[PDB]
Amino acid sequence: IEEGKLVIWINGDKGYNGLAEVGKKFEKDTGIKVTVEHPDKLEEKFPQVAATGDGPDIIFWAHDRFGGYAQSGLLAEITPAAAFQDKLYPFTWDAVRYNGKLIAYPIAVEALSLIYNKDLLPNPPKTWEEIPALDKELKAKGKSALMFNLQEPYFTWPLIAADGGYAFKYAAGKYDIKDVGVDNAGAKAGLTFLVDLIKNKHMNADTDYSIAEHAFNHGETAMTINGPWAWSNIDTSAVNYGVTVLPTFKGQPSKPFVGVLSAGINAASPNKELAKEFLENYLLTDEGLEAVNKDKPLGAVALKSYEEELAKDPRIAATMENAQKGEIMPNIPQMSAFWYAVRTAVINAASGRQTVDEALKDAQTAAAHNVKFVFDAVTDIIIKENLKDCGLF
Amino acid sequence: MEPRAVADALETGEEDVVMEALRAYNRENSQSFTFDDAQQEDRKRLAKLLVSVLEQGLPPSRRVIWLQSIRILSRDRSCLDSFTSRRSLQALACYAGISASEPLNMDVVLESLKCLCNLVLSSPVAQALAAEAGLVVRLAERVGLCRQSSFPHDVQFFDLRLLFLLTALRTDVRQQLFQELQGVRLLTRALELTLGHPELLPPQETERAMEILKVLFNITFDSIKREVDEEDAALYRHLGTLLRHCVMLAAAGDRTEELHGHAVNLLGNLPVKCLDVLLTVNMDVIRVLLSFMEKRLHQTHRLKESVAPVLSVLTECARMHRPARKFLKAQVLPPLRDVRTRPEVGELLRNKLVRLMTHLDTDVKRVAAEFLFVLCSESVPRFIKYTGYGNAAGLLAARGLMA
Ligand SMILES: OC[C@H]1O[C@H](O[C@H]2[C@H](O)[C@@H](O)[C@@H](O)O[C@@H]2CO)[C@H](O)[C@@H](O)[C@@H]1O
């Protein structure tokens, strides 16, 4: 890992080009080069390369993964002066608090919202139950009502948690490992409605992030569920869109998992002081955050002074309203195993491989024990191997 | 020819100078699969110029050359999203003759199928638009032409490859080929004609047969229910007979093992009752299946997918056919002389199969133990005698045979 440089990793759906602008300004004043990269499977790649002493100088991700990173000794302690800590909201400082120690700099609050096409759908629905009727009315013009990423549980979880589903119960001022609400009556009811949309052919089980984004941004589907990072591509497209509150399931609000984008410093980095100056004096300023927000919107930024310039944005207001009706993600190391189990459960329930009760039952056991059922059936291995044997021509 | 220069010719260039620019780029990069990140935006600009004319419609003069440039650029992840639009995928499907909506140039068809294979393989958006466009309908039909078709081997192979990619990646297309299009009957016919009873399968027929097997695996691995009718049973039995021929057949180019593996994997999806054709004493097929499995026991990282299908097939043959059960018992579990050496020690077949009974993978444990169990005629003390109690305990516990 090079010294005298700063290598930064941030997810590919974020403003990595905007972050490169902040690195240019950093090189202009100090003469230090800054490289921004967005590798695939970033949340898995960083543990494997940082545990060996490599990886980036600074790692960007939502706060939920940073506890497992800190528990493995992968993150260095950050030392923001009390004068700097007051420039950011305290609630975002909470999200990067692991064992009473600050492990990452918070950047911005994220939450899913209902994005809709004002031309195809001037009055967006307020409940999930009317979406089947709405998709019926929209199929008459070659369009559909709703499409969103069904390959990541983050996007399904708002419907799951609405009626009572939860991750780890917060009690006695702590998350307890063994209280998991993945297979209760509410999470079963939410996942069942999701599966019933797919059986009734209002949504396709194979829809991923890029398929959903492509459909909405080309005016094919009237609604999509996504976060602040997705507004730029909809701006660039010919779609006239609004960002509103998520629909209500069973008369209750959808509860999205609120994430706080955070920048962690690598323990193996020999530039822990340059990383501090870049994140405090360049990124977490009005100039640094605007450069990134101009690329892909961040949401409600942690820096007080610049959140004031964005708060009137009706899209930020809808992001916060959904954030208020949701739950701040835990950052316990068990979160990594929690997402792995719920990802398998959503896919299996949607694809019809398991029932709703089966998929959530297996996810509860794995999430309650911080274990990963790395199974894969024989027929699934054969297809994945036949696919892997196919190359380009 | 650099990407920026070739893109310049397409914009401000005469007909004869834009074709040479593409002609030279196709020569320099006909085998380019890695791309320099420096000229990334140059290639994306060139790719958007190629797609604009493709969406408008290419004149028949410059069609093979235009598609080859698109096929080369489709190998790059950065230029990928430029080619994955409805109009673009509709143009490629029309030029390939598989659009649902003019004579066909066989070179244009070949290049269009290759383009479609690249985009479908690489892009979920392309997979989604290909499902919407219903390409599988005309694809299966042309594949179903069989001896009625003078289509070249290349076109027939890339139809199957595109058929494999759609059915592997898209479950809606996979179910559409199985249910609406009756793909099992369609591909069983296509398999029957690709095989001809030659004692050696030529290289071309070997490629298409194995694609047919992999497509058949995609549409049968989780769609065939336990109880079928006699039409499906006669259909699956007939398909099983062709798989019996593959198991007994040799393939040119040292690909006989690759063909057998796909044949065995597809056998593992058929209804268990349809495996009787493997026997119609006469244990030539079982002997080949047994040594097929015996050679697969060396796989470590991919042991599961290598031995579970054939073991499951051997287990069902032994369970329903007494001469097969007894023949396999004589081959796998010969009568013991000295009962001192532990079953899980040694390099004999019985020793390799016993060690799998305590494998880490629960599928390998069940499949290996079930095999030796039925060879012991489901007798608990006979099962313990040959495999040892500690190794036998897993199966006996799962089946509630302790009491
Ligand atoms: O799907 C599970 C996934 O959810 C969250 O990931 C979000 C991320 O927070 C967003 O900023 C954006 O990148 O979308 C992601 C979902 O694809 C968790 O942060 C992540 O740990 C978890 O695996």
Residue numbers in the entry:
A (entry chain M): 3 to 395
B (entry chain B): 1 to 101, 107 to 201, 208 to 291, 304 to 426
What does the study report here?
Notable among these are the resistance to inhibitors of cholinesterase 8 (Ric8) proteins, which regulate G-protein biology in species ranging from slime molds to vertebrates and, in contrast to GPCRs, act on monomeric Gα subunits. The interaction of Ric8 with GDP-bound Gα stimulates release of GDP, leading to the formation of a stable intermediate complex of Ric8 and nucleotide-free Gα. Although the GEF activity of Ric8A and Ric8B was initially thought to account for the ability of these proteins to positively regulate G-protein signaling, mounting evidence suggests that the Ric8 proteins can also serve as ubiquitous chaperones for Gα-subunits. To gain mechanistic insights into the function of Ric8 and its interaction with Gα, we solve the crystal structures of both apo Ric8A and Ric8A in complex with the C-terminal fragment of transducin-α (Gαt) attached to a maltose-binding protein (MBP) tag.
However, the use of bovine Ric8A1–492 with an N-terminal His6-tag led to well-diffracting crystals of the protein in complex with MBP-Gαt327–350. Residues at positions 1–426 of Ric8A other than those in the flexible loops (102–106, 202–207, and 292–303) could be modeled clearly based on the electron density. The crystal structure of the Ric8A1–492/MBP-Gαt327–350 complex revealed an interface that buries 956 Å2 of surface area (total buried area divided by 2). Residues Gαt333–350 contact the concave surface of Ric8A from R2 to R8. Residues Gαt335–346 form an α-helix that rests over a neutral surface of Ric8A, whereas Gαt347–350 is in an extended conformation and lies over a positively charged surface. The C terminal carboxylate group of Gαt F350 forms a hydrogen bond and polar interactions with the side-chain amide of N123, as well as the guanidino groups of R71 and R75 of Ric8A. Furthermore, the side-chain of F350 is involved in the T-shaped π–π stacking interaction with F163 of Ric8A, which is held in place by the T-shaped π–π stacking interaction with the neighboring F162. Another hydrogen bond is formed between the side chains of Gαt N343 and Ric8A H273. For instance, I339 and I340 of Gαt occupy a hydrophobic patch formed by F228 and F232 of Ric8A. Thus, mutational analysis validated the Gαt binding site on Ric8A identified in our crystal structure.
